[PDB]
Symmetry: C2
Subunit: 79 residues, 2 copies
């Protein structure tokens, strides 16, 4: 698990607009990972931008870590 | 194992100068991976360049796939 978590964080931090991973909760459902995470974003991004960054994160992380079968990503202002 | 192999190939293909992964043999030594691989390179690169590309591959792949504890990388001309 720690290895997979590190990969998740690393992958999310490489997406344009991510200001760190604020929270990540991952669990195994069998051999699959289900995860929920919160990213920081620029407070001055629009809500639509923040939604776009979240969807980019989801795409990036799921594309890199094939065992993830469910990933929810939300955003919070971070300075 | 197949998952780790895919990661190895993907990581090697992203290094400047790699013209595919020609061969990859990976084995588990306990929970660690030991691997030997051959990359393609431009026939017109110098032997020194090809050595540099191999060392870049080793660095890239070991940095991405933490379970690898031994990785030998050689090069062959590829068109
Ligand atoms: Ni949308
Ligand atoms: Ni040297």
């Amino acid at each position: 698990m720690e290895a997979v978590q590190n990969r998740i964080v690393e992958a999310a931090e490489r997406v344009p607009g991510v200001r760190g991973v604020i929270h990540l909760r991952a669990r195994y459902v069998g051999q699959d990972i289900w995860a929920n995470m919160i990213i920081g974003v620029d407070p001055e991004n629009t809500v639509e931008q923040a939604h776009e960054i979240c969807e980019a994160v989801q795409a990036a992380v799921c594309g890199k870590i094939r065992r993830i079968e469910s990933l929810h990503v939300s955003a919070e202002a971070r300075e």
